[PDB]
Design a protein around this ligand. Structure first.
Ligand SMILES: C=CC1=C(C)[C@@H](Cc2[nH]c(/C=C3N=C(/C=C4\NC(=O)[C@H](C)[C@H]4CC)C(C)=C\3CCC(=O)O)c(CCC(=O)O)c2C)NC1=O
Ligand SMILES: C=CC1=C(C)[C@@H](Cc2[nH]c(/C=C3N=C(/C=C4\NC(=O)[C@H](C)[C@H]4CC)C(C)=C\3CCC(=O)O)c(CCC(=O)O)c2C)NC1=O
Ligand SMILES: C=CC1=C(C)[C@@H](Cc2[nH]c(/C=C3N=C(/C=C4\NC(=O)[C@H](C)[C@H]4CC)C(C)=C\3CCC(=O)O)c(CCC(=O)O)c2C)NC1=O
Ligand SMILES: C=CC1=C(C)[C@@H](Cc2[nH]c(/C=C3N=C(/C=C4\NC(=O)[C@H](C)[C@H]4CC)C(C)=C\3CCC(=O)O)c(CCC(=O)O)c2C)NC1=O
Ligand SMILES: C=CC1=C(C)[C@@H](Cc2[nH]c(/C=C3N=C(/C=C4\NC(=O)[C@H](C)[C@H]4CC)C(C)=C\3CCC(=O)O)c(CCC(=O)O)c2C)NC1=O
Ligand SMILES: C=CC1=C(C)[C@@H](Cc2[nH]c(/C=C3N=C(/C=C4\NC(=O)[C@H](C)[C@H]4CC)C(C)=C\3CCC(=O)O)c(CCC(=O)O)c2C)NC1=O
Ligand SMILES: C=CC1=C(C)[C@@H](Cc2[nH]c(/C=C3N=C(/C=C4\NC(=O)[C@H](C)[C@H]4CC)C(C)=C\3CCC(=O)O)c(CCC(=O)O)c2C)NC1=O
Ligand SMILES: C=CC1=C(C)[C@@H](Cc2[nH]c(/C=C3N=C(/C=C4\NC(=O)[C@H](C)[C@H]4CC)C(C)=C\3CCC(=O)O)c(CCC(=O)O)c2C)NC1=O
Ligand SMILES: C=CC1=C(C)[C@@H](Cc2[nH]c(/C=C3N=C(/C=C4\NC(=O)[C@H](C)[C@H]4CC)C(C)=C\3CCC(=O)O)c(CCC(=O)O)c2C)NC1=O
Ligand SMILES: C=CC1=C(C)[C@@H](Cc2[nH]c(/C=C3N=C(/C=C4\NC(=O)[C@H](C)[C@H]4CC)C(C)=C\3CCC(=O)O)c(CCC(=O)O)c2C)NC1=O
Ligand SMILES: C=CC1=C(C)[C@@H](Cc2[nH]c(/C=C3N=C(/C=C4\NC(=O)[C@H](C)[C@H]4CC)C(C)=C\3CCC(=O)O)c(CCC(=O)O)c2C)NC1=O
Ligand SMILES: C=CC1=C(C)[C@@H](Cc2[nH]c(/C=C3N=C(/C=C4\NC(=O)[C@H](C)[C@H]4CC)C(C)=C\3CCC(=O)O)c(CCC(=O)O)c2C)NC1=O
Ligand SMILES: CCC1=C(C)[C@@H](CC2=N/C(=C\c3[nH]c(C[C@@H]4NC(=O)C(C)=C4CC)c(C)c3CCC(=O)O)C(CCC(=O)O)=C2C)NC1=O
Lengths: 65, 177, 164, 86, 164, 164, 164
């Protein structure tokens, strides 16, 4: 099986396959899709967004970032 | 979760005073509005499954790329979740019609929906189209002007309440976009 | 079996709290709308047999294919089960009119009806045809009363929206 | 009409049962039933339906089964297909 | 998408164990019965159009009331949706024959079909009439082969038992 | 109804005499060209729906203004009348193709065609477009014998030269 | 979407200033010329179908070579895309008449049209032939009104000057 950390970072799958019981909107906003951003090579892009965060997995905001 | 009453009370709490005259006067117009709101919620509830069916079927028939292979309605399970979501949207709109204030609709369902449909890849314009079809169908049931059902009620003007329900559906459709 | 009383008792019990004035206003509304509901319950207990008979007759008047091959009512026995089922649905509409919520109709009739109906090849559209016939066979001033008539329509509409 | 008709003298039995039944003879229909124009408010008396199927339910069934959509040959589904969009 | 491979990979993964000789025997059987399944998939991709056409034709041949009033296929458009749906089910039978489990047929066709079908008034017995027509229109030596034909029957039987 | 046998029987009948050897030679030629005619009849009865489909589709492909207002086949019903009329035409081509004389195609289809079309507003040139599409489309060698193809084209040519 | 309102709100917002009397005079002029614009929008929504049909008919009446070889409208389908595109242009002229600026016509129709038209081999001169045909088919007192007619001419001229 998958590590307790690793499951937090990974993903949420589709419903009819991965999870029988439907999920709250809260858990899509809070956990979801969690990718860090690489170091900026320009002055314009630095102070707008945080870099890769550790022991925290944001979701659905990181899509927009 | 706040009704009309709780909105008056919380506003008077930020103002730090008692309830007073004019706010209670508007709330007297609410209680006199009363059975029109009751019968309105009865009209939107007792047709609701049929509203969801017609609205989503109309959403697909306007835009046949949803049912095209690769679209977000292309599967039985996607279609089931689609119908389920339309049912939930009409459910919370009916809650907002009983309460008289959209605090229930904002706290339950509208909070975190845009990011959810972004996260799932649901097209937002198609959802706003389905919400708009539920809007026009629902106000057509609320004025008792449906072309397939004309039920007996005693006569009375209900423009204000229809504008209220249209405000809730425009809140949802504006919220997903 | 959900009603006004069980909802506010169940809610105030869930909070662990004594029943405040809000619950008292709820049961106050129950004893306000009570007279309409009991009127419609009395008249339904009056002519239930003609209601079930006309309902099932229109149900086979629409779908004739049931009594044809049939993977449906294909005997006098199964037509007896047909009119028994319409007797049960009207009996539960009567029970839900007396309790005044959708409690006994939901917990006796609607809950897990779908597994039985998809298992025993029973089409739902035939039931829906029956109930829409009864709902169209209502009267505004003639048979019941305006207001209580509306209550009855609501109950029957709930059955239809639970079945479609 | 022989020059036009040629060889198609129809028998009396076919001509009665043909298309022009009501116009071959019009006369000898025996006791045409007439429906009176009652007001719906007053039922006027004692009538028992005495039918297997209820009068209301039967009229409902005849109105539901009324006229089948005629599937035509050329809207028929081909191999492949695309659903048309409004 | 369930198959032999995903079952033993999913199981050995769930144990956290390397794949032992038992998994190897499972995939050994997959590559044993493979040739039959792919034969039936090839022939189904051969004449699918006539299969779907005869299937829907017998589907309206049994239940004619759909094209009567109808709360069903009531236009040539909805009959085109009919033959589209039978195209989908045969296409998923083709896919389950290629995968060799009931995987894509279950996850694309069967899962949550019941809510759609009871929501949009679609009777299941019409589909079942179509598939039982196709299953009766099979041949023992003529069209496919004995053993692969059995495989095809099994898949279509699964559809029927998932729908009734 | 014109054929070899009706012409010769009507001829010797006009002379008031028994059929001589000349009429016998004529019906001998009828039973010589018979197998080519009936071969064309078998293939026409085989694939008439596709022929009428390509005919009407090419007919509106050449002339788009038929679907314009209100001048012609602008509605679904009128285009249905189009396809059923071309069904009658191929049915009469099959009929005269079996007979071998242009009798039944003439007396059923050709006689009084002109009077009917002008009052209604039916363009004959679009019919010519349909038949000349089917005339050109057919392959002499691939779907039949050379002799039958000739017979078929001849019948269709008669239709065109009788139309406008 | 540019209009009077968005121009003065966007300008006063860009200054960071309250809307002075000048902005109020601008929107005063908008509600002066509004009646004319809405008259022409009502009549455009009246007979748009005849406008688009005569427009495209004159469009192929001028350039016949498109329906010849064509690297253009070479089917009835592509002529349907032709009349669809003229439907879109008239619909955006309607939208710009309701807004009263060239906003939605520019942001939906004109912006990025040139890459699509040079990429998909679509000549602009055929569109320009269609619009100049509609502009020649105008009337001074007859169909709209003098003043509002002028408004319509201006909008259509803008399309032409954006396309050539
Ligand atoms: C299902 C897949 C799956 C994985 C791939 C692992 C990945 C993984 N590794 C660790 C955790 C760890 N992984 C390593 C491994 C490393 N030691 C080093 O010197 C190298 C850089 C690296 C090996 C190449 C170490 C040392 C830890 C413990 C780290 C620590 O506690 O400081 C953890 C946190 C939980 C734990 O402590 O075990 C997880 C989720 N776990 C899983 O469930
Ligand atoms: C180019 C250089 C560059 C940086 C130096 C960072 C700096 C930075 N970090 C944050 C923002 C943040 N930075 C972190 C990081 C963490 N907080 C913790 O408590 C953990 C210990 C630590 C991870 C190891 C977090 C969690 C936030 C968001 C909340 C906060 O302010 O702590 C923000 C605000 C915008 C945002 O939310 O992303 C900025 C500008 N961003 C950049 O682009
Ligand atoms: C309490 C309120 C509440 C909601 C409003 C819904 C919102 C919602 N919808 C989905 C999920 C979904 N919602 C839809 C719906 C759509 N299908 C389309 O064709 C349209 C764009 C759209 C209907 C208008 C679909 C198809 C999915 C499944 C998406 C997928 O798995 O690909 C999910 C993820 C969990 C799941 O799979 O069910 C959630 C949280 N759920 C809630 O709990
Ligand atoms: C517990 C649930 C519950 C309800 C659902 C209502 C239902 C209801 N409405 C009315 C009564 C009424 N309801 C309406 C409402 C309408 N006005 C219109 O223009 C629309 C058709 C419709 C709103 C959508 C009107 C106008 C009356 C008064 C009718 C009259 O007196 O002519 C009455 C009769 C008593 C009264 O006058 O208030 C009742 C029982 N009452 C209840 O106790
Ligand atoms: C407990 C609830 C309850 C009801 C709601 C009624 C419903 C009902 N109505 C009728 C029967 C009837 N109902 C009507 C009413 C109608 N006349 C019209 O012009 C309108 C369409 C409509 C009023 C709006 C009429 C006319 C009949 C008699 C029909 C007939 O005999 O032709 C019957 C058959 C028995 C009878 O003849 O009375 C029944 C069960 N009865 C009940 O027991
Ligand atoms: C408490 C409420 C309650 C109900 C509402 C019924 C519902 C119900 N009906 C049936 C069962 C049945 N119900 C019908 C009825 C039908 N015949 C048709 O032609 C029509 C479609 C339809 C009448 C309108 C038939 C025919 C069966 C037997 C089905 C069969 O065995 O094939 C069964 C399975 C057990 C049995 O065989 O009796 C159940 C639970 N039972 C209950 O306990
Ligand atoms: C991946 C698999 C897959 C399927 C199997 C289908 C299943 C399916 N069918 C319909 C929808 C439909 N399916 C039919 C079909 C029927 N017409 C009848 O007369 C018969 C009872 C039946 C054919 C045997 C019809 C008519 C509709 C439209 C129903 C309506 O809008 O009223 C819908 C809703 C979306 C739509 O309108 O297309 C779905 C999900 N779709 C899929 O994605
Ligand atoms: C991919 C799946 C697949 C099927 C399920 C079949 C189904 C099928 N069978 C036939 C057609 C046929 N199928 C059979 C088979 C037989 N008839 C008998 O009486 C015997 C009992 C039985 C052999 C055991 C016969 C004889 C025909 C031709 C005549 C007929 O319709 O019976 C046709 C019409 C086309 C043709 O003539 O070949 C079709 C679509 N075809 C396919 O491609
Ligand atoms: C036995 C042989 C036989 C035929 C061959 C047809 C020929 C025929 N067609 C029509 C009548 C018609 N035929 C057509 C057909 C056309 N629509 C178009 O767009 C095309 C030009 C054309 C198809 C290629 C139409 C549209 C009508 C109805 C015309 C009208 O009512 O305006 C009529 C008049 C009666 C009627 O309305 O049906 C007749 C006799 N009928 C017969 O009995
Ligand atoms: C009863 C009379 C009768 C006919 C006259 C034919 C006419 C005909 N030909 C084709 C179909 C065809 N016909 C041809 C023939 C041609 N190849 C060329 O190079 C030449 C232009 C031309 C021969 C002179 C070809 C190639 C096809 C297949 C076209 C394709 O699939 O691209 C089709 C479509 C069905 C099919 O694919 O077979 C039909 C109806 N069929 C009939 O039933
Ligand atoms: C919102 C406004 C709006 C428009 C105005 C159109 C403009 C437009 N037309 C086409 C596309 C097209 N437009 C035409 C039209 C033409 N056929 C001809 O013979 C004439 C020259 C011309 C009609 C006068 C054709 C034929 C195509 C398809 C071109 C091709 O695929 O070769 C495309 C590419 C996408 C597609 O294929 O549909 C676009 C963006 N689309 C829009 O969204
Ligand atoms: C919204 C934009 C819009 C247009 C651009 C017009 C365009 C237009 N004009 C006509 C139709 C017409 N347009 C005119 C106008 C005149 N013909 C003359 O010879 C005069 C010089 C000129 C007046 C100055 C006339 C007379 C007709 C009818 C006959 C014709 O076609 O010329 C028609 C056919 C429908 C009808 O008869 O009304 C259309 C679509 N209509 C609209 O709705
Ligand atoms: C061909 C693909 C197709 C459809 C499917 C429909 C779907 C559809 N229903 C509408 C709207 C609509 N639908 C209904 C509900 C519906 N009507 C009734 O009288 C009863 C009993 C109903 C359920 C059975 C109502 C009541 C309305 C409002 C209009 C009205 O008064 O009828 C609207 C208008 C939307 C809008 O106003 O923005 C659409 C598009 N349209 C299509 O083009």
């Amino acid at each position: 099986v998958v590590d307790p950390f690793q499951r937090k970072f990974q993903s949420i799958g589709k419903i009819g396959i991965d999870y029988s019981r439907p999920k709250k909107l809260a858990t899509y906003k809070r956990v979801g899709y969690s990718v860090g951003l690489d170091f900026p090579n320009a002055v314009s892009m630095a102070g707008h967004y945080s870099l890769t965060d550790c022991t925290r997995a944001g979701g659905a905001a990181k899509i927009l970032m | 979760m706040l009704d009309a009453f709780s909105r008056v009370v919380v506003n008077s709490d930020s103002k730090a005073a008692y309830v007073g005259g004019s706010d209670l006067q508007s709330l007297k117009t609410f209680i006199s509005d009363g059975n029109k709101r009751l019968d309105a919620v009865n009209c939107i509830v007792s047709n609701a499954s049929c509203i969801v069916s017609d609205a989503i079927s109309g959403m697909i028939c306007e835009n046949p790329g949803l049912i095209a292979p690769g679209g977000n309605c292309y599967t039985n399970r996607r279609m089931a979740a689609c119908l389920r979501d339309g049912e939930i949207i009409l459910r919370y709109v009916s809650y907002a019609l009983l309460a008289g204030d959209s605090s229930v609709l904002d706290d339950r369902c509208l909070n975190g929906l845009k990011e959810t449909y972004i996260a799932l890849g649901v097209p937002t314009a198609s959802t706003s189209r389905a919400v708009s079809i539920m809007k026009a169908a629902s106000t057509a049931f609320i004025m008792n002007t449906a072309s397939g059902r004309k039920i007996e009620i005693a006569a009375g003007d209900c423009q204000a309440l229809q504008s209220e329900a249209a405000a809730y559906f425009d809140k949802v459709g504006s919220a997903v976009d | 079996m959900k009603s006004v009383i069980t909802t506010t008792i169940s809610a105030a019990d869930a909070a662990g709290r004594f029943p405040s004035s809000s619950d008292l206003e709820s049961i106050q509304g129950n004893i306000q709308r009570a007279s309409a509901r009991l009127e419609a319950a009395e008249k339904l207990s009056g002519n239930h047999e003609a209601v079930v008979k006309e309902a099932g007759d229109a149900c086979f008047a629409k779908y004739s294919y049931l009594k044809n091959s049939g993977e449906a009512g294909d005997s006098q026995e199964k037509i007896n089960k047909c009119y028994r089922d319409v007797d049960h649905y009207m009996r539960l509409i009567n029970y839900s009119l007396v309790v005044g919520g959708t409690g006994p109709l939901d917990e006796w009739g609607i809950a897990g009806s779908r597994e039985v109906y998809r298992t025993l090849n029973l089409p739902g559209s035939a039931y829906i045809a029956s109930f829409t016939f009864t709902r169209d066979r209502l009267c505004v001033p003639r048979d019941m009363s305006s207001q209580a008539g509306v209550e009855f329509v609501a109950a029957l509409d709930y059955v239809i929206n639970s079945l479609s | 009409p022989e020059l036009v008709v040629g060889n198609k003298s129809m028998t009396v039995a076919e001509q009665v049962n043909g298309v022009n039944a009501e116009s071959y003879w019009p006369s000898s229909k025996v006791r045409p039933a007439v429906a009176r124009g009652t007001s719906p408010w007053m039922g006027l008396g004692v009538v028992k339906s005495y039918a297997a199927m209820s009068e209301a339910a039967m009229a409902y069934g005849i109105e539901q089964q009324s006229k089948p959509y005629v599937p035509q040959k050329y809207e028929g589904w081909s191999s492949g297909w695309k659903p048309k969009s409004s």
